[PDB]
Design a binder for this molecule. Structure first.
Ligand SMILES: [Mg+2]
Ligand SMILES: [Mg+2]
Ligand SMILES: [Mg+2]
Ligand SMILES: [Mg+2]
Ligand SMILES: [Zn+2]
Lengths: 71, 221, 129, 220, 24, 135, 102, 83, 83
RNA sequence: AGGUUCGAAGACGAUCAGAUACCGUCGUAGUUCCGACCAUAAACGAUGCCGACCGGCGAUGCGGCGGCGUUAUUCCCAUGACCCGCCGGGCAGCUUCCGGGAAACCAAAGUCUUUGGGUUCCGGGGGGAGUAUGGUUGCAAAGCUGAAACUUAAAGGAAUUGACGG
């Protein structure tokens, strides 16, 4: 089980901050690699220049051409 | 029974000892440990006759507490006691069930065997486990005739005597019948009952088919 | 090893109560155990109890009245104040109508209502309802 | 036109038993749904919680039946939950209504604090359990309403609880187990022992033993 | 693929990578 | 082979025997005639099958009771079963072999030292129980 | 899903049990896990005891017996029908099959 | 059973129970007076002796240490002391 | 129940097991309530009135309803003291 | 050092559409011992340790304490082999509506929303991945510590019904 002593708060806090790295949301928001890899760079919107108009096939159960732009 | 009128008699003790009624099995139940007197070197547990008499009187009080004699149901799935329960029901107005006990008698209100008793009386918990279990769905208190090795899962006034010997089973069904009738206003308590304990006894068809013809031969010659 | 004699006593009483036993024996006795059982006794949740005196730590036989639901313990004896006692009440007691939180204060071992009445806080020992 | 075959049904039909609490006191099982509509007439409200089409894999593809959960109860202290599976939806609905009527329990109501008028909330926090679903009902002050998921919310409303906090844990998406856990929590409100119930109980005559002379002549 | 044979193939891949890095 | 009866004839045979035991008898043609008016049987081929099973069952009934019942038969067995009550009880033996330990039990109950009781030599060895396992 | 409480072997207070070779395929099997079949065969078949006794010089010869303790892996045991698959309730019965002695 | 009288258990259960598991601990051992033959001196010996005791007067030994209890040699009588 | 104005705001008061002091729920069909008919002092005849006990389902399912009823009878004097 | 048997690799003979295998005949390293490494197993009870409480039963191993009797010797006790018990520590088994749990099942995996006896390790959807990099250990094989980008709406567990099975 877990420790319950009156002066185990250091161990409890250290264990929390050590185990908080084991869920994807906290790691994503606090490591910085996801923000670095994000093409928007942490912005809600971004402006760009259309390079090419391309079609993307939908997934397997569906059958359609999704119209996209390379930007 | 704490009174002197409701006390053990020497003739009753003699009937008990003659039919056995105090030799149980080689195994003991931890809930019957407080009824057992002492186990002999043979390995047979000897019950306490005063305690089994007290339990018998308690069950008789519970039975006579019910207004409608038809509302108490006496049952037995074993032939060593079928005759006893039939005679008991005839004597005391109870409703007998001898032999097969159809499941759903107390629970399923569709079949013609369905009935609602207010008290169940059982020859043997191990044999009549099914009616005991069904009594747990219908708020039905039960009295059982328990041996030294029988469970007490759903029992209230278990008489801690015997459920193996035909003589013992018949004798104690006769004891219960006589006590409920005596506590009711039908017997004077002074003279012995005219009903013979051997009447409640069960006997094997091997001797049903020979005793009467031997007796008829004795009568003709 | 055994580090909380009060916790062991309370768990033993809880188990006996759930089994329906009329009596139960707590093997190690303590002054805190006696006081805790005394407040339970005064509120009526248990009956008479006996302190068997051997020359070691004594034993206790309590009579269970069948009116106990839970008599747990709060093993880390936290510092409770009169400003945050009611949060403990809400977290532990089943309702505001009944149930008690026992705490040891400098005025003695008492229940939370008496502690509030005489305006003192202390260390929470356990609860019973 | 209701012809009972039960001692309890006969007593109810002959008006010997004046209230459902008389049966509840002696814990007698209700085996005829016509017993309880005698007592709660034009006051039992009915609701269908869900219709889940379970189906059993056979040679013929899938044999589909329908399971109906029905919450019934008067908005005054009696609620019941019934589940019935049948080949047809309407028959499942009727069977579930009858089963819910059979499984009606009384609901004990208390006060959050400072008892003034009629009791409104649960007397103490209780916990129902079914499958993995755990439902905890917590007493709430007057005027809060029933704060819960819709499924136990309507069940508590039909039970007659006006105010209640709740906390649910487990796979509550299983509507059957969620409703059954809430029903168990509601049921055990009387089973919970409270200091006001510490008084030594007095025993009255059972309906059967009180009206033995009626049952012999009537229920022959 | 059996997990043990995946382990073996991974060992071979790691050996190949180590040899390439050692060459460079 | 292949003469096993069916529920359709057996149920009917039991029912008509229960209803009209007094009217019916142990003669096949008499039974096949009484059935013609006590039951509206659409088929003769089924009627006489029913009659045959009825004769079989009633021949059984004359000897002993079966799963099909009759109230007069119950009363007859009740008035006949209470018989062969012996002139001397099976529980009034002149002597009763009794154990020393049970004798101690009787003296505890205060009903010991009775003339009818005769103590026996206690068994020696304590050789009860069966050997454990095979062999 | 644990099929057997004993895991199909008699190993409770042990750590390791020495193996044996199956008497049909030479599979290494733990000794407690193996199926043991102790055969006391007659050294002479029932169709030959008459001829042997007729040709025996001695007046009354007790023909010997072949005592062999077979061990089987469960694969060989099931293939040779020494043991059979049983229902979930039947698997919990440790009583050996009847001898059919009468 | 539910109504076991934990406060006043009977002597047979008390003696049957373990030493430490009794209501109050009571040792199962005792001291005994022992008279070794050919002398007059009476020696007090523990019933669970771990040594090899002996009368000072009489050269023979009196107990052989065994597993549980002292092993009095043949011909030596012993008496309990105050239970 | 019994709010501060004095009226009993409770539609019924449930029975309690006379053995283990537990509330007998409305759906506890295992539970029983049983009467024992006492007799008059001299002639040992049923005198009309009785004495009632109640046993809850869990208690009378674990197997100790026998002991419970026996103790209750001893307490009420139905079963003699020297039992 | 020693190398009988067995037997990775390998050869050959079979089998097969193919057969780098399953089968057979050999057969190297190894399998054996001593010294020095390596530190991994479905290293499993897939189940932390210490402590308290909560049913029943029959056994079994060790020790101790009692008891009818049988046996071993001798002239008697012990003292051994049995028989009937009790106690304590064990490996376990059967049963139970104690209780728990998704259930399978478990007297522990119980005493858990009526949630707190003490304390250690450790998981956070599935993959990528036990991978890359860095450090460290090793003669090596490798061991320990150990991500990210990217990808995915499931992957899983227990039970149920069916369908199928060489
Ligand atoms: Mg191993
Ligand atoms: Mg070779
Ligand atoms: Mg710890
Ligand atoms: Mg993950
Ligand atoms: Zn094999």
């Amino acid at each position: 089980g877990k420790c319950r002593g009156l002066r185990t708060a250091r161990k409890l806090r250290s264990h929390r901050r050590d185990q908080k790295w084991h869920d994807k949301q906290y790691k994503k928001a606090h490591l910085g690699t996801a923000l670095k890899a994000n093409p928007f760079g942490g912005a809600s919107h971004a402006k760009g220049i259309v390079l090419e108009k391309v079609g993307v096939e939908a997934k397997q159960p569906n059958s359609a051409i999704r119209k996209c732009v390379r930007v | 029974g704490a009174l002197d009128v409701l006390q053990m008699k020497e003739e009753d003790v003699l009937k008990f000892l003659a039919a056995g009624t105090h030799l149980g099995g080689t195994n003991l139940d931890f809930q019957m440990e407080q009824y057992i007197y002492k186990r002999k070197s043979d390995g047979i547990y000897i019950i306490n006759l005063k305690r089994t008499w007290e339990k018998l009187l308690l069950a008789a009080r519970a039975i006579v507490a019910i207004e409608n004699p038809a509302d108490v149901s006496v049952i037995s799935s074993r032939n060593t006691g079928q005759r006893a329960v039939l005679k008991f029901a005839a004597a005391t107005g109870a409703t007998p069930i001898a032999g097969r006990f159809t499941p759903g008698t107390f629970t399923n209100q569709i079949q013609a065997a369905f009935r609602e008793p207010r008290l169940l009386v059982v020859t043997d918990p191990r044999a009549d486990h099914q009616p005991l279990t069904e009594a747990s769905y219908v708020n039905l208190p039960t009295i059982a005739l328990c041996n030294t090795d029988s469970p007490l899962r759903y029992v209230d006034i278990a008489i801690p005597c015997n459920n193996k010997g035909a003589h013992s089973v018949g004798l104690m069904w006769w004891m219960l019948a006589r006590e409920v009738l005596r506590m009711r206003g039908t017997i004077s308590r002074e003279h012995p009952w005219e009903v013979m304990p051997d009447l409640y006894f069960y006997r094997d068809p091997e001797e049903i088919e020979k005793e009467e013809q031997a007796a008829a031969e004795k009568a003709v010659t | 090893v055994r580090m909380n004699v009060l916790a062991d006593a309370l768990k033993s009483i809880n188990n006996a109560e759930k089994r329906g036993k009329r009596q139960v024996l707590i093997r190690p006795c303590s002054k805190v155990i006696v006081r805790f059982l005394t407040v339970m006794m005064k509120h009526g949740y248990i009956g008479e109890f006996e302190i068997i005196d051997d020359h070691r730590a004594g034993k206790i036989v309590v009579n269970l009245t069948g009116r106990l639901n839970k008599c747990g313990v709060i093993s880390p004896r936290f510092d409770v104040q009169l400003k945050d006692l009611e949060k403990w009440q809400n977290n532990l007691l089943p309702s505001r109508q009944f149930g008690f939180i026992v705490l040891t204060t400098s005025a003695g071992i008492m229940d939370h209502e008496e502690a509030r009445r005489k305006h003192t806080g202390g260390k929470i020992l356990g609860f019973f309802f | 036109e209701w012809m009972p075959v039960t001692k309890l049904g006969r007593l109810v039909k002959d008006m010997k038993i004046k209230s459902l609490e008389e049966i509840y006191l002696f814990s007698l099982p209700i085996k005829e749904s016509e017993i309880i509509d005698f007592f709660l007439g034009a006051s039992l409200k009915d609701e269908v919680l869900k219709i889940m089409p379970v189906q059993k894999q056979t040679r013929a593809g899938q044999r589909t039946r329908f399971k109906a959960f029905v919450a019934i109860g008067d908005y005054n202290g009696h609620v019941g939950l019934g589940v019935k599976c049948s080949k047809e939806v309407a028959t499942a609905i009727r069977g579930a209504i009858i089963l819910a009527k059979l499984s009606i329990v009384p609901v004990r109501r208390g006060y959050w604090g400072n008892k003034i008028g009629k009791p409104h909330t649960v007397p103490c926090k209780v916990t129902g359990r079914c499958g993995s679903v755990l439902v905890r009902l917590i007493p709430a002050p007057r005027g809060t309403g029933i704060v819960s998921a819709p499924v136990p919310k309507k069940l508590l409303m039909m039970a007659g609880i006006d105010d209640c906090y709740t906390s649910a844990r487990g796979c509550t998406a299983t509507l059957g187990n969620f409703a059954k856990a809430t029903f168990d929590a509601i049921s055990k409100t009387y089973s919970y022992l409270t200091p006001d119930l510490w008084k030594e109980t007095v025993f009255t005559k059972s309906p059967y033993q009180e009206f033995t002379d009626h049952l012999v002549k009537t229920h022959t | 693929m059996r997990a043990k044979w995946r382990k073996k193939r991974m060992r071979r891949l790691k050996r190949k990578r180590r040899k390439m890095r050692q060459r460079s | 082979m292949g003469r096993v009866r069916t529920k359709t004839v057996k149920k009917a045979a039991r029912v008509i025997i229960e209803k009209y035991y007094t009217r019916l008898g142990n003669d096949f043609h008499t039974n096949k005639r009484v059935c013609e008016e006590i039951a509206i049987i659409p088929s003769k081929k089924l009627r006489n099958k029913i009659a045959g099973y009825v004769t079989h069952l009633m021949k059984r009934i004359q000897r002993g009771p079966v799963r099909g019942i009759s109230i007069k038969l119950q009363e007859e067995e009740r008035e006949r079963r209470d018989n062969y009550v012996p002139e001397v009880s099976a529980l009034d033996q002149e002597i009763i072999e009794v154990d020393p330990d049970t004798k101690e039990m009787l003296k505890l109950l205060d009903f010991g030292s009775l003339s009818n009781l005769q103590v026996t030599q206690p068994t020696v060895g304590m050789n009860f129980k069966t050997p454990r396992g095979p062999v | 899903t644990k099929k057997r409480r004993n895991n199909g072997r008699a190993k409770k207070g042990r750590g390791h049990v020495q193996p044996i070779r199956c008497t049909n395929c030479a599979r290494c099997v733990p000794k407690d896990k193996a199926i043991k079949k102790f055969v006391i065969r007659n050294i002479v078949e029932a169709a030959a005891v008459r001829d042997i006794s007729e040709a025996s010089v001695f007046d009354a010869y007790v023909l010997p017996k072949l005592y062999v303790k077979l061990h089987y892996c469960v694969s060989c045991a099931i293939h040779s029908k020494v043991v059979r698959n049983r229902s979930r309730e039947a698997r919990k019965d440790r009583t050996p099959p009847p001898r059919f002695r009468p | 059973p539910l109504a076991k009288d934990l406060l006043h258990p009977s002597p047979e259960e008390e003696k049957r129970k373990h030493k430490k598991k009794r209501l109050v601990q009571s040792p199962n051992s005792y001291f005994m007076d022992v008279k070794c033959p050919g002398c007059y001196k009476i020696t007090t010996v523990f019933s669970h002796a771990q040594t090899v005791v002996l009368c000072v007067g009489c050269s023979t030994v009196l107990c052989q240490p065994t597993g549980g209890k002292a092993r009095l040699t043949e011909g030596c009588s012993f008496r309990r002391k105050q239970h | 129940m019994q709010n501060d104005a004095g009226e009993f705001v409770d539609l019924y008061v449930p029975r309690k097991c006379s053995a283990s002091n537990r509330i007998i729920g409305a759906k506890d069909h295992a539970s029983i309530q049983m009467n024992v008919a006492e007799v008059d002092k001299v002639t040992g005849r049923f005198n009309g009135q009785f004495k009632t006990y109640a046993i809850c389902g869990a208690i009378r399912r674990m197997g100790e309803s026998d002991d419970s009823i026996l103790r209750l009878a001893k307490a009420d004097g139905i079963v003699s003291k020297n039992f």
